Specification:
4 helices; globular; binds chloride ion; 3 strands; mainly alpha; bacteriolytic enzyme
Length: 129
């Protein structure tokens, strides 16, 4: 499913992401925008043989199991295909674990390069939240 901007912001807020570990909702919407263009079905393969999955492009080496990444840790304890559902609950629960592990949102390269230090509140402007 390809979310709308305000639609996605509302689903993320409902799932407890607004100000989670200090990160306002605009940050999470901005990161979803540049990681996946709001598409829950997005997948991207990396040179190390790992693959990123879903609206927040979560990586198979550490966080989920896709059956084809050697040395994978499956820290969110889910199949990576669960991260592609139109229901974003699995992605949000896993992202909560990722953002909590010490490096905050710098774990997402697109966020670091395209959202960090910008006016991220523009991503929720105009939405009925
Ligand atoms: Cl914000
Ligand atoms: Cl980038």
């Amino acid at each position: 499913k390809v979310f709308g901007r305000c639609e996605l912001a509302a689903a993320m807020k409902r799932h407890g992401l607004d100000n989670y570990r200090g990160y306002s909702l605009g940050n999470w919407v901005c990161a979803a925008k540049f990681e996946s263009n709001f598409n829950t079905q997005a997948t991207n393969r990396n040179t190390d043989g790992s693959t990123d999955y879903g609206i927040l492009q979560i990586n198979s080496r550490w966080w989920c199991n896709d059956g084809r990444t050697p040395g994978s840790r499956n820290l969110c304890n889910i199949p990576c295909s669960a991260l592609l559902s139109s229901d974003i609950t699995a992605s949000v629960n896993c992202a909560k674990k990722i953002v909590s592990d010490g490096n905050g949102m710098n774990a997402w390269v697109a966020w670091r390069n395209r959202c960090k230090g910008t006016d991220v509140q523009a991503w929720i402007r105009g939405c009925r939240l």
